[PDB]
């Protein structure tokens, strides 16, 4: 690790600076360095890690989708052969995306998840594990595609089981987990009915618990509830 010589606190400080500068690759590298110091992450630090890699892989995914679209058009009946370049470059971006996902999964496996005992940390990390296997699934086409999908499903399921036992239904981590697991069902697992059921039940159970919340907690929970509603509107 090229961050091995930098103080943990300096890495966290520089991650925050990189965020302000919208330098998310740097932010991710700084947070990888911080994780590799071996200490557990605080709540703020976990979110710095997740924000950084979500932004990096989100850009990769958007680029991959553009290139995959161009590639599929080049392969339609009536297209002029353009040679191997579109496939090659899509593969290049794909390999870089897979590398980022493997990096994040590696950090979770060495050793964030195994040291995470509190529900807020353990559910957060298992959600991330589901998310990054989901991104691998989005580009997977080989002998391993089913296993990648099942790895995402298993991580999301363990996170769901913990969240239902240990968190209130309005907990934003619980809500965001359900939001994303619902998208996994719809987009990855060819299970739109499960996706819709999960989003609706999550929304309704949250609604019934909003009365317990402060104004600031209410704002956080209703924000994610609106994303659940948005997806349900897209799907029905």
């Amino acid at each position: 690790g090229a961050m091995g010589s930098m103080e943990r606190a300096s890495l966290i400080q520089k991650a925050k600076l990189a965020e302000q500068a919208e330098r998310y690759e740097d932010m991710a590298a700084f947070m990888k360095g911080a994780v590799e110091k071996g200490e557990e992450l605080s709540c703020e630090e976990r979110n710095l890690l997740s924000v950084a890699y979500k932004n990096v892989v989100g850009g990769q995914r958007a680029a991959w989708r553009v290139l995959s679209s161009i590639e599929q058009k080049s392969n339609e009946e009536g297209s002029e052969e353009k040679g191997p370049e579109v496939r090659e470059y899509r593969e290049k971006v794909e390999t870089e995306l897979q590398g980022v996902c493997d990096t994040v999964l590696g950090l979770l496996d060495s050793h964030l998840i195994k040291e995470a005992g509190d529900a807020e940390s353990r559910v957060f990390y298992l959600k991330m594990k589901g998310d990054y296997y989901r991104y691998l699934a989005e580009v997977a086409t080989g002998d391993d595609k089913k296993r990648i999908i099942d790895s995402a499903r298993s991580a999301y399921q363990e996170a769901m089981d913990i969240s239902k036992k240990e968190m209130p239904p309005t907990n934003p981590i619980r809500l965001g987990l359900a939001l994303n697991f619902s998208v996994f069902h719809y987009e990855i697992a060819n299970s739109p009915e499960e996706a819709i059921s999960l989003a609706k039940t999550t929304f309704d159970e949250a609604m019934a618990d909003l009365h317990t919340l402060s104004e600031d907690s209410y704002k956080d929970s209703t924000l994610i509830m609106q994303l659940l509603r948005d997806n349900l509107t897209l799907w029905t």
């Binding site: 965001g176 994303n180 998208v183 994610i224 994303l227 799907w235």
Partner: peptide, 5 residues
Amino acid sequence: FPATV
């Protein structure tokens, strides 16, 4: 695309 967080 659907919303995720």
